[PDB]
Amino acid sequence: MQIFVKTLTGKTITLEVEPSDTIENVKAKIQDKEGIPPDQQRLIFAGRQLEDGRTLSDYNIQRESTLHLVLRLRGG
Amino acid sequence: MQIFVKTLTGKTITLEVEPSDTIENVKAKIQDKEGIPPDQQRLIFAGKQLEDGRTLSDYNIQKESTLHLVLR
Amino acid sequence: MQIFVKTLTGKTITLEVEPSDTIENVKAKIQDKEGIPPDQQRLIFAGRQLEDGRTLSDYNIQRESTLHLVLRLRGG
């Protein structure tokens, strides 16, 4: 299935994932589409930050759901 | 000065701050107005997480700037 | 009738008003006599702030009444 990742700066990114994929999995896929390293990504759904390890089905993220993406830059 | 704090769930909050206010000071002001403990607050400006120990002027946050708040 | 709008620095503004005059009208009268814009005016009577939509008679402001003027120094 496909999820929609929208940055708070206005960029929308469509990704290819599956319910068994962890949050660390989608972070590695965003690194492909946009080049953001996984250690500097934070994914938001329902106003809460998503944890590396728990899956998309674990957070009740269904098909065509919207995720939010922020940067975590130390020194930034 | 007056800044705006928006959640991604809908609520918009107005805050009275100073340029020399630190990020943790803004979080304590958010806890006062909202009840959210600063432990679970993440402030966002220009698309990136804001660090504790920095000030609002350090990120060039000025009058009527919009910060975003997400729960950790 | 006459009312007296005094500042916290002793400046007394004598205004010729009517009991049916609204607080906005009083502020516009102050702006004419002195030049203080209305949005910069906080008007106090009997220790409480006066609302724009009310009239003078609404606050039992009779003749020879003394009002107090505090400046709203917050610009934009």
Residue numbers in the entry:
A (entry chain B), C (entry chain C): 1 to 76
B (entry chain A): 1 to 72
Describing publication, verbatim:
Branched Ub chains are formed when two or more sites on a single Ub molecule are modified with Ub, creating distinct bifurcated architectures. Sophisticated mass spectrometry (MS) studies have revealed that a substantial number of K48 and K63 linkages coexist in branched heterotypic chains and these K48–K63-branched Ub chains have been connected to nuclear factor κB (NF-κB) signaling and proteasomal degradation. We engineer a K48–K63 branch-specific nanobody and reveal the molecular basis of its specificity in crystal structures of nanobody-branched Ub chain complexes. The minimal branched Ub chain unit is commonly considered to be made up of three Ub moieties, with two distal Ub moieties linked to a single proximal Ub.
In this K48–K63-branched Ub3 structure, the K48-linked Ub adopts a closed conformation with interactions between the two I44 patches of the distal and proximal moieties, while the K63-linked Ub adopts an open, extended conformation. Previous approaches to generate branched Ub3 used a Ub moiety lacking the C-terminal glycine residues (UbΔC).
